[PDB]
Chain length 161, copies 12
């Protein structure tokens, strides 16, 4: 006849503080990566300027989309993101991007390292995130895949022979 | 040459339990889509337009979801049943009420029914994943998208 | 201000209980049709699978747009639709769609019959709808036209000449 | 040449003065509605501003397309529209829209009333239009349907249940 | 199963021979119009060539969509269209389009007359069509409206005021 | 830290004169749009189609213009009045005539009324620019686009 | 300066034979388009939908083709005649039958009539090419596209 | 004949002070984008959806703006700094508060932060305009677009 | 403060065995694309058009898949080999037969070849998943998409 | 097995005479584009708008054409020269007159200049075709497209 | 009551000969830049060929759009542009582009200089244009901004460290 | 009266075995080029990586479209293509692409040579194809033109001064 549930209030999945903190770590590194990516995009000069200028904007697009995905995943699971500038600066694990113009070769090396750092944060929190919520780990997989692709597309400029 | 011979390589086939598990997800997705449209038409009051619009996006997602699940069943040699009698008789979702409903009531009602739908997917997840990880990925997309819908809808009623 | 009306409140056209009832009958058959169309879409097998699989989705798209149109027309005229599963199952005039895989030949005949039942419901209510509100009768004409087109496009598969 | 007519000049269907007059009445109320819709769009303030601001532009889009449709239908049938500011102001049946900023609650009620007055004009002329030219009555059905949809979408904001 | 019908076969609405005949008359005039429209499109020369050349293609697009609509409506209602060259030539009511290059002034008058003849055919069959099937009459309204718009857009070139 | 404190930083607000100046531009833009449609429907004769089409582009521009100006007013705490009575009572544009009008007449009539509209914007420009340069940029777009429309329309009647 | 003087450089003009040759291609293209629509509406039976859809693509191509040829005629100072009487009286295509026709019959009928149309283009090709190679390129596009249509349609009836 | 004979002609160079002025605009645009996203995620309550959506539109505009300014800097051989430390250390915007915030609070908070960003642009405007009018036009685009966002957002809390 | 201090931090490196596993997937995806095109061209008979079209959809998916796998290899510093000799020498797929083939035969042939490709992905899945879960998700996308293609194609020959 | 064993195989090389032939086409296409824009700006009178619009379509085609020719030159290692001095010094087109010109005059002027451009292509055609048939096909595209433009434009002045 | 003006003829803004001449100077340099940009686009060879090939086409697109904008602004203000090849060659201030293939490095330097020259013309005429017509100066600002952006995007290839 | 042909069966153009074999030669080289192009696309590293990565994908797109065009032309003319991997490997005339990563400079040289080889096959079979069927030769012209353009766009990277 009927399999319908009777509750007037069915709660959603609530993330633990640890899980919330793990997604927060991913978030600040994705935002920092986005900010560094734009810095590089503006300030790269030299041989093959245009390709890097353009590829960096694609990296920024992906990182911005990723940061929105992570922050909104946090919101869906009743966690509260902090993407404010002071928090990002105080808590990012990425080495700082240097000031002023940088050569194409240096930008390639610098950004590759910073992508590598961002991915490392995602890989570090992965198993804990997966254990609590496999659906969030899938979002992490997309970020890993997308960012490591960016790393290859950027770094290959400096790879010799 | 590493070429195989077999002129009849059969596809991966779902166990009856696996098919039954996807059938559970399917009816709740269809029921959610029907309830979402009902809410979409009959919601009234403060912030009507936002709710009206958001509910349709929920329905879009839930419909795409039901098709995905039903066709995954087909791919794995299982047979979906999305007929009205079956949905009404087997859905775990609390019945959505008839008639006009306030935006505040619709927010609470629909959030409960999304959560009910997610709960079904979360209930079958581990058994699905154990048999076929590729199908559990489809479940993850569903969980992610619906829990996003719950957040976007319920936030309307959130106080301070 | 010459021809301007001075009423503070000007009320809209309100559907009679008979009118509301008549559109409700159309609504449940459109929704039932959509549900059966998907069932057929998923479970059809055999000769010319792909064409039928594709046409059935087009039928479903039209029936879904149709049900939304009718339900929203009800709302516009201060009537209240009921498109819930229990109501559709309990009140649809469509012959039940069978379970399990069905041959393309079977599906063509089954769906043609169910489309025709849906159109019949619309044709049955048409004159009473038209008498109260010509504008709504026009929406019914769209449905009759579009559904009868679907019936021709599907049924022609089984036609032997 | 078997069934071919041999007339050098075959004249088109020409609207009667009554018909032309009736479409003119629809035209001025559609234009007045568009103008008031923009006024409301600009000057609405308060709770749920954005939704109302957006819906009012959709109303205006529909009313503008509607007025163009009516005026061009007049032209097609050898009638002459007058959509000039003085004429619209002097001959519209719509209650004047108030000046200054208006609350969202106020705007909902005000615009619902003005939409309803516009629809009333169309409903009043409908039968006389339909008697002379069924094809034009169909354009009126489109307007009635679309405007009553707009009224429902707007008015529902103020509905307390 | 409460309100569900139990008929194995539910047949669709079938057009009478009179109805089928009436739509066939519309069909041949729409196709003749399309053919003449292309002839005019290609062979028009003189003052305001480009505008006429372009408008004639829009007329042809509408007439082609119209003929497809009518023929498919026939099919939907178990009637059989005949749009073959011999049939169109033998049974069209349109005055023959002249051969060779034609001035823009000449083309405006010629095409206006042929559009009007096409609309006349639709207007002549309208009431008999509407009496049997209101849904098809609505398709006729679309054709009347669209073709009379075309006539206005074309004929206005030759209007001296 | 260079961070400011103030929890209530107010926006730039237009003087009454500034608001009045934008109101002047607004009514002429709306009136032009209404006259443009009137011409669009009622133009007849040689080169009807081009004029019919061009007039609609004029109307599109003038409507986008009126919205831009009215919303700029809103941004600066001014209140537009685009109602029919106000437009008829306060527009500086010579009245467009009723009834069918020849393409040659429509070209001359509409050119005059575009020029009237541009003249209003040119009349208020310096006072607008002195108070708010950002708003004068919107005026420049209007001047540029409308004077383009005048050229595209009037060239029809240009002899040799 | 390598600038020429001539204030009246005339265009390439087609001989009467060339115009007559393009006229031949034109009527067969128009007739094919009319027969294609007839088949599109009246085809019934096994695989109706594919045939119904493919026939419309044939018609699209044939219509674009007829316009291309007729306008090429215009470019070269020739005058097309695509009127119904002329098409019926001068087309080389076997008459398409009235009434409902099976998909199998429609495949055979339409293939024959496409081949008839291609044959016309192939018949006039060398004479067209000798006078104007640029026009023969248009003929090649027609041959290529129609022979593709023939393959896509006839393959339905191909046994083993 | 009128051709200049230098093998390399130099482009326009921004003074370092001009560069510093655009840098002030840049950091507040970036700060505003970051705060807008914070608000976009964390806003809850009555009319959540409209605010959530409008805040993304604000961020889109602010991100486009910061790109425009940074690339204008580069065109004139100034060197932007949009790094997190620099933005945090030098922005004039009041810090956005942590945690969930009501729609009413978000409206007032974001309006103030938009108004602060506009204030920076208005403050540097004249010094920028004096050196390079073309850059001032970009500033006008920002003032116009941001003040529009301020109106669109603050209107939610306006009581009349 | 929390910033890491290495000038160069290394990314994730795939073991050569992991690389070899993706290489197995790659060659079968490329082989499947090549066979799918062969079938697409050479299929004849009843329901030709649907098969012709569906086979192109399969090829689109397989080509996108092989690109995804090859680029995942590159991301992790493995080196793909999609050259014709390598594909022919190392594919596990049964060879596709030459010449025209009936729609019924093509359905059975292509279903088997899809099933072989899926089998390869399923065979390497666990070893891939153990080293890099993110790559396994790409494998799941392929399994899901290919098994869908298998169902869509094989359904033609299913008799119920 | 059938693989060629040269490490570098040379591509097809255009003779310098072939290069010079395409160069003749190039300068007249560029000249035509420049004159077409001149006419586009300066045309006045009866049916201004159609001419203004058609002239832009001509220019679009001529610009696409000149790019096609210049890039064909580069493909075959010829080196185009589209510089203003070279175009002015070597074009075969009669100079376009200065100042405003009536629509009737523009029609006749532009038709002649199109016809001159076509004449150049037709003049070099056979020498181009003899060396490289693939390039001649590009010439055919130009002849066809330009002769279409000639008909579309000149038809305005045709009296029948 | 009424604020309507009474003139049957209201003239538009007419540019002085000096203003007309100033826009003419901008026009010939924009056209020359477009022609040189295509020359460079075709004939650039060497390291980073593709990026420059592509960026040069974007420069050409902008310069062509700019030349149309300036010429049409002239037309709007009753001035008469001259974009003919002989005039452009005789009156452009740009140094001539050299013949034959050029290296990527040389093309970067050459084109940067020619953009710089084009912008200089716009900057030279600016204040005079602005004094007479501020709305035209705004168009000049767009050209300056757009072209200096192109200069940066092109020149950065050759900028070292 | 009537020019209609009387045959119930009109056959299409059938290609000779030689013609079929000539198109087969073009086909295997186009497929081989596509496979080598993707290999290069994945494995190119070094200075100007991105441009080559991207340009190679465009080459692949063109070659794949070309191979479909040739195979389908064969089908239209009753010939039977063989694009299977073993056939392509056994019968392609292209030198083999080397294994593993290759520098940008080496990839430019290698791919240019392989395009040159592919075009050479098309040029070798051209006159024979043209003699039998001029319409197919036109398709060959498009391939020659499109591929030689790719060759220029790729090779220009390595061309010095
Ligand atoms: Cl919204
Ligand atoms: Cl036009
Ligand atoms: Cl299909
Ligand atoms: Cl690029
Ligand atoms: Fe995933
Ligand atoms: Fe997983
Ligand atoms: Fe009716
Ligand atoms: Fe209708
Ligand atoms: Fe300014
Ligand atoms: Fe040829
Ligand atoms: Fe501007
Ligand atoms: Fe060609
Ligand atoms: Fe978001
Ligand atoms: Fe589906
Ligand atoms: Fe809806
Ligand atoms: Fe209109
Ligand atoms: Fe059709
Ligand atoms: Fe607006
Ligand atoms: Fe045409
Ligand atoms: Fe940028
Ligand atoms: Fe790729
Ligand atoms: Fe190019
Ligand atoms: Fe232009
Ligand atoms: Fe294909
Ligand atoms: Mg590059
Ligand atoms: Mg809202
Ligand atoms: Mg089929
Ligand atoms: Mg015209």
């Amino acid at each position: 006849m009927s399999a319908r549930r009777t509750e007037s209030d069915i709660q959603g999945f609530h993330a633990t503080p640890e899980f919330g903190g793990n997604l927060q770590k991913v978030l600040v590194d994705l935002i920092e990566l986005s900010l560094q990516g734009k810095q590089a995009h503006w300030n790269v000069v030299g041989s093959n300027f245009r390709d890097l200028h353009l590829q960096l904007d694609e990296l920024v697009d992906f990182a911005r989309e990723g940061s929105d995905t992570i922050a909104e995943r946090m919101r869906a699971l009743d966690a509260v993101p902090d993407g404010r500038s002071d928090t990002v600066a105080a808590t990012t694990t990425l080495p700082e991007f240097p000031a002023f113009e940088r050569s194409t070769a240096d930008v390639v090396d610098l950004i590759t390292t910073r992508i590598n750092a961002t991915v490392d944060t995602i890989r570090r929190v992965h198993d804990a995130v997966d254990a609590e919520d496999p659906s969030t780990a899938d979002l992490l997989h997309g970020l890993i895949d997308g960012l490591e692709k960016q790393a290859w597309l950027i770094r290959s400029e400096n790879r010799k022979v």
